[PDB]
């Protein structure tokens, strides 16, 4: 029931990684906020892909 | 990575996966 369990399963089946994970809840506009979050995270050396 | 290596791989910021003999990407020992 957690928003980030989806995210987790992605990491437990495909890309096994010690990468950052920041999962957002921006209601209707979530998908974009996610782009932001991902964007910023990448522009801070936190991750490249 | 095989389990025994994990701590090392996690800490060597340059450890990277090499192609292997079956075609599988592994961290090398």
């Amino acid at each position: 029931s957690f928003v980030n369990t989806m995210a987790a399963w992605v990491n437990m089946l495909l890309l096994s990684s010690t990468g950052p994970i920041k999962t957002p809840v921006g209601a209707c506009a979530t998908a974009v906020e996610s782009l932001d979050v991902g964007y910023d995270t990448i522009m801070q050396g936190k991750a490249r892909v | 990575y095989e389990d025994r290596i994990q701590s090392k791989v996690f800490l060597n910021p340059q450890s990277r996966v090499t192609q292997e003999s079956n075609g599988e990407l592994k961290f090398p020992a």
């Binding site: 010690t18 | 994990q6 701590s7 996690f10 800490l11 060597n12 910021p13 340059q14």
Partner: protein, 96 residues
Amino acid sequence: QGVLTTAREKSGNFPSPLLDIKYRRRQLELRRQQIKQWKESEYLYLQEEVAAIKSQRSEEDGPFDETAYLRERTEHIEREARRQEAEAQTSFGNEF
């Protein structure tokens, strides 16, 4: 043990110079000097470009407020200098 990788590091035989605050000290005020000299080199360049567009200005072109144009331009060299400071301050104290 994901969180273990916040201690990921492969140091050679010798520690990075950057861990030494003095090394960063040098390099910092190195760029601080390197910066103060640009600050003037740019002031010069604006002086030239000032009368350099006085000579090209036709009489149907708007009268250039030398006070206006040279104000915004100096203030800018100021900001831009200050900016450049904090930014070298960034790459040597914060995010090195």
